[PDB]
Amino acid sequence: PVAMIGGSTTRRYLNEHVTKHLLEGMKLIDPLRVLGQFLIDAS
Amino acid sequence: STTRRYLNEHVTKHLLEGMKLIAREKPEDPLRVLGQFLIDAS
Amino acid sequence: SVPVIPYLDYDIVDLGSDIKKPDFPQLSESHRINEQQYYITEDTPLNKRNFMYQPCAANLMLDKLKYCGTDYFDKSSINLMDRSDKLAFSLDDHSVSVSENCGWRSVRSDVCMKEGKIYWEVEVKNVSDTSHIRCGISRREASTETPVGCDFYGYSIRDKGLQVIHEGRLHTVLKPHEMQAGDRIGFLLTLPSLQSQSEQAMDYSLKRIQELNNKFNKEFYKFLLRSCEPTNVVRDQIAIRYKNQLFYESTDYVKTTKPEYYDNRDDMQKFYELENSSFEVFVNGVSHGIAFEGLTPFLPPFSELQYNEKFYLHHEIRNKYVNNNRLGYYATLSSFQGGTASIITEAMELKFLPKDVDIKTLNDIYNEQIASDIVWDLIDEI
Amino acid sequence: NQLTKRKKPVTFARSAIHNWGLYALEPIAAKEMIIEYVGESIRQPVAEMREKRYIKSGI
Numbered sequence: 441p442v443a444m445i446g447g448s449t450t451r452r453y454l455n456e457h458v459t460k461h462l463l464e465g466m467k468l469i470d471p472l473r474v475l476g477q478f479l480i481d482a483s
Numbered sequence: 484s485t486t487r488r489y490l491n492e493h494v495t496k497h498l499l500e501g502m503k504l505i506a507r508e509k510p511e512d513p514l515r516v517l518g519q520f521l522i523d524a525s
Numbered sequence: 526s527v528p529v530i531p532y533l534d535y536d537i538v539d540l541g542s543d544i545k546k547p548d549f550p551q552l553s554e555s556h557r558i559n560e561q562q563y564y565i566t567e568d569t570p571l572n573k574r575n576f577m578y579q580p581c582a583a584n585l586m587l588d589k590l591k592y593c594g595t596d597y598f599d600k601s602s603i604n605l606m607d608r609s610d611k612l613a614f615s616l617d618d619h620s621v622s623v624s625e626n627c628g629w630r631s632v633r634s635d636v637c638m639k640e641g642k643i644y645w646e647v648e649v650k651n652v653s654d655t656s657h658i659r660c661g662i663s664r665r666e667a668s669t670e671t672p673v674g675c676d677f678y679g680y681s682i683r684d685k686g687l688q689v690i691h692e693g694r695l696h697t698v699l700k701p702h703e704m705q706a707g708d709r710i711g712f713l714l715t716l717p718s719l720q721s722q723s724e725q726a727m728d729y730s731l732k733r734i735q736e737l738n739n740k741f742n743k744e745f746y747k748f749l750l751r752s753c754e755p756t757n758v759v760r761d762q763i764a765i766r767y768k769n770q771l772f773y774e775s776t777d778y779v780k781t782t783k784p785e786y787y788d789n790r791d792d793m794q795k796f797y798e799l800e801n802s803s804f805e806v807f808v809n810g811v812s813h814g815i816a817f818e819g820l821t822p823f824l825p826p827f828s829e830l831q832y833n834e835k836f837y838l839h840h841e842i843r844n845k846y847v848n849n850n851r852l853g854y855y856a857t858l859s860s861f862q863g864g865t866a867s868i869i870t871e872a873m874e875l876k877f878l879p880k881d882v883d884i885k886t887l888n889d890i891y892n893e894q895i896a897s898d899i900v901w902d903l904i905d906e907i
Numbered sequence: 908n909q910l911t912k913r914k915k916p917v918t919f920a921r922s923a924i925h926n927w928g929l930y931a932l933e934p935i936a937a938k939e940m941i942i943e944y945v946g947e948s949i950r951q952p953v954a955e956m957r958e959k960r961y962i963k964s965g966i
Contacts, residue, residue: 458505458513461514462514471525472498473525476519476520476522476525479514479517480514483512
């Protein structure tokens with residue numbers, strides 16, 4: 441999966457867990473308050 | 484540079500500081516706290 | 526003109542395959558100092574011809590970039606790119622050590638030091654009568670093979686007496702106390718804010734355009750200092766395969782001169798210095814005074830990138846003085862014929878910590894180096 | 908010392924171009940070695956200082 445394809449590091453959690461739908465909230469992006477809930481829609 | 488023109492006036496201050504805070508420590512869901520903190524950014 | 530490069534057999538990795546994504550700088554026996562075996566890096570590329578090299582990972586999630594940034598080591602330590610070929614390190618103490626007949630070299634540590642109060646300590650593991658050590662500061666502009674203190678891209682500390690180094694000079698402005706076999710150096714490094722750097726960036730932008738500028742055509746060099754924006758980045762960081770493995774051809778700055786802006790009041794050349802910088806050493810945790818109030822404000826207009834003067838002026842085209850996520854002063858460590866000294870990262874290994882409120886290690890900024898470099902290139906994906 | 912046996916009897920004298928120059932003491936043919944270049948070996952950062960240090964004094 442993306443746990444090691446993003447990098448071989450224990451600080452490489454980001455390319456699988458968090459920053460996947462952070463960039464995919466940015467693929468539609470504009471104001472900043474609607475970006476706070478594009479942070480939400482992976483949960 | 485069009486997205487690089489518009490966003491770099493705006494995205495560089497708050498969202499980079501919003502990602503410089505989540506780099507320090509991480510809970511089981513960190514998408515709630517930075518999403519809350521960007522409501523505080525407005 | 527060229528397309529992006531696809532993925533190979535080691536790029537898309539299986540679940541149980543715990544292979545590491547850039548290939549390891551493999552260890553080979555160099556010499557035996559401090560009764561330890563120090564080890565070299567064999568097949569990795571090294572920073573030459575005013576360039577650098579960086580590990581990439583085959584990121585699958587993006588369309589334009591098939592490669593984004595990543596690192597080897599979990600915490601901070603010596604970067605492997607700024608390294609000599611007769612320079613050795615270890616996994617025990619992470620000390621840099623050149624050979625017994627090798628000369629004056631240096632290695633930076635990859636913390637990108639822009640603003641805030643950042644502090645780290647430097648272990649002095651061994652010193653002899655014939656061995657010298659110059660731990661200090663240097664930029665990404667300054668290179669590794671020269672011992673730093675050669676230019677104003679870095680300042681270091683002398684071995685005995687702590688004569689603070691600047692352009693080859695030896696200033697005895699702190700309290701002199703020589704290194705021994707059980708010593709340590711703690712760089713209390715006060716940098717002002719990034720807003721304080723950004724207004725010095727417009728100060729060189731507004732005073733190189735039209736104040737002294739009346740060569741044959743200089744409006745197109747005025748235009749690059751006109752559009753000299755305080756944080757904005759024009760990066761050319763592309764991925765290349767090299768010795769069967771994946772790396773970066775990241776651009777590096779070229780050497781420039783002293784920024785001397787004529788203030789009308791001072792009736793002389795006035796120099797660009799930062800907002801109350803502080804250069805303090807912790808030899809075993811005692812205050813030694815402040816050496817440098819004059820760390821430079823550098824980010825767009827003080828370091829000149831690898832830019833083309835004849836190919837590019839005919840025409841789209843980039844700008845001369847821009848930023849990136851790699852610009853800053855770096856935690857620097859030099860050695861001389863085997864002078865072994867180590868960098869120390871985390872507060873559990875810190876022995877002499879100051880009471881401060883803003884004590885920030887590398888790994889706060891190193892985690893910020895991981896988290897910004899992805900999202901500095903998540904604006905590149907559009 | 909390896910390439911000493913293969914050289915030519917050229918002397919130095921006062922030059923027709925500049926202060927000092929070499930004067931080939933025999934009719935050398937097309938592709939023969941005149942002289943192996945001999946000297947120091949020092950790398951780029953240490954020769955960066957010497958490139959200005961001699962001209963700081965002004966040789």
